Amino acid sequence: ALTSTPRSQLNPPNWPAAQVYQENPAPTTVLLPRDAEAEVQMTNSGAQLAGG
Amino acid sequence: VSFKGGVFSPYLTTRLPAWAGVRQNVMGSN
Amino acid sequence: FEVDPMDEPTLLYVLFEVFDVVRIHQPHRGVIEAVYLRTPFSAGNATT
């Protein structure tokens, strides 16, 4: 009575989308390495960017 | 001025100019 | 060019005295970034 969500029928056949353990993960912040605008401008200028 | 030991077309190749007989030396018409 | 006729096949050799600069940077431990360049005879342009 302190660990069971009040049900209407034991072993209910379809646990709804609210009383079941959804997992929220923290938003995945990615550090986009590069700015394509500057890379394209530099490569057009004649440079030949190459490396990590 | 032989081209032996020579590559095989050391020279820029230009249009076959689509005309009528700058294509080969051969016989022809009826 | 001119050349004295040598019966042995020979091939020319010409250079264009072009800057070949390079800049090499390392932002983080274990990463290396490079920029190649050839001002009058660039090795890459907008077409690649």
CB–CB of A51 and C34 under 8 A? yes
- Helix, strand, coil share (%) of chain C residues, nearest 5: 0, 15, 85
Please name which of C25, C40, C41 lies closest in space to residue A50, comparing C-alpha atoms: C25
> Which residues does residue C24 pair with via DSSP β-bridges, in sequence order?
C34
Angle at B15 between CA C2 and CA C44, to 5 degrees: 70
Using a CB-CB cut-off of 8 Å, the residues of chain C touching B6 are: 9
Please name which of A42, A38, A41 lies closest in space to residue C36, comparing C-alpha atoms: A42
Q: Number of CB pairs < 8 Å for B and C?
A: 6
Using a CB-CB cut-off of 8 Å, the residues of chain C touching B8 are: none
B6 touches chain C (CB under 8 A): yes
Using a CB-CB cut-off of 8 Å, the residues of chain B touching C7 are: 2
Which amino acid is it at A42? M
Residue A46, burial from CB neighbour count under 10 angstroms (0-12, 13-18, 19+): middle
A42: alpha, beta or left? (left if phi > 0; alpha if psi -120 to 50): alpha
CB–CB of A46 and C39 under 8 A? yes
Helix H or strand E segment including A51: strand A50-51
Quote the CA–CA distance of A38 and C35 in Å, as a whole number.
13
**Subunit partners of chain C (3 or more CB pairs within 8 A):** A, B
